[PDB]
Write a protein that binds this ligand. Structure first.
Ligand SMILES: [Fe+3]
Length: 308
């Protein structure tokens, strides 16, 4: 039996754990928490941690653990299962990316069309969109979007984007609320994450929604994908079952279990999502370095400076 420190959503984690227990007969215990807190706990515990595997919604939390020598190597064959073009790879082959979530633009297709959409997420923060674009400044993915803009286009552009949202956008407390506002006719479009919309569409049927999704694609900062993954702890005294769990997560059945539970893009090429997601490769996600704590601190400073 194994212990998994879990920073991912409980439904994702519970569903793959249960499919693992059913496939192998090995029992999984989750120790859930926020990825950044769990990572800190793993570093403090060091070679006496009870953790066998670390399962996270955000692969960026792994870099520090790897650099501190706390992660075990994973099978090369396992890594290759999700190694699509654009998918982040552990330089030391000591963690694996498993799935993704995407930034998207949701729009009311009875008021706007694909033709009204912009080639860049930068352009939604301009007077053309005044009173017409919702955004969620408190959302973790929104913070990731600022980090990517900063890295890809520099601080002046990031700040100008945030200042433009301040001036032109409608602020919503959550992505689900921004989605409702589009459905309700309050705002014709918003910047959200993919899964909120695919959840609603699975629930109600796409034909019954006013809203559709526009993916900016072509490695625009607005095509940002955030990656979930897993790692085996070097300290684990059950490497064999820990590695079997990580291999299962990368397998067809493990990826099938994940996508049945959550609207994340599988990184295996031979699994389709029952939420009817497009293939990961079609997203044309940009390639961007892992968000550090320092990156998050800086992005918060820019949001503050923009008056948000
Ligand atoms: Fe969310």
């Amino acid at each position: 039996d194994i212990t998994v420190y879990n920073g991912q959503h409980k439904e994702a984690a519970t569903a793959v754990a249960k499919a693992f227990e059913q496939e192998t007969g090995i029992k999984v215990t989750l120790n859930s928490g926020k990825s950044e807190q769990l990572a800190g706990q793993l570093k403090e515990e060091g070679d006496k941690t009870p953790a066998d595997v670390f399962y996270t919604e955000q692969t960026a939390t792994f870099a520090d653990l790897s650099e501190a020598g706390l992660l075990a190597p994973i099978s090369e064959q396992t890594i290759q299962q999700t190694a699509q073009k654009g998918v982040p790879l552990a330089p030391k082959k000591d963690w694996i990316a498993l799935s993704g979530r995407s930034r998207v633009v949701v729009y009311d297709h009875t008021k706007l069309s694909e033709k009204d959409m912009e080639k860049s997420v930068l352009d939604y923060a301009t007077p053309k969109w005044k009173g017409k674009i919702g955004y969620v400044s408190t959302s973790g993915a929104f913070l990731e979007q600022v980090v990517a803009l900063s890295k890809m286009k520099g601080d002046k552009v990031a700040l100008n984007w945030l200042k433009g949202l301040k001036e032109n956008g409608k602020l919503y407390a959550k992505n689900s609320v921004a989605l409702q506002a589009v459905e309700n006719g309050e705002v014709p479009a918003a910047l959200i994450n993919n899964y909120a919309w695919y959840n609603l569409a699975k629930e109600k049927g796409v034909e019954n929604l006013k809203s559709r999704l526009y993916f900016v694609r072509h490695q625009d900062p607005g095509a940002l994908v955030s990656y979930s993954g897993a790692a085996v702890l070097k300290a684990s005294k059950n490497q064999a079952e820990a590695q079997k769990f990580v291999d299962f997560l990368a397998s067809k059945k493990g990826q099938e279990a994940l996508v049945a539970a959550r609207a994340e893009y599988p990184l295996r090429a031979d699994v389709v999502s029952p939420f009817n997601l497009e293939p990961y490769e079609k997203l044309e996600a940009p390639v961007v370095s892992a968000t550090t704590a320092q990156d998050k601190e800086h992005a918060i400073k820019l949001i503050e400076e923009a008056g948000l």
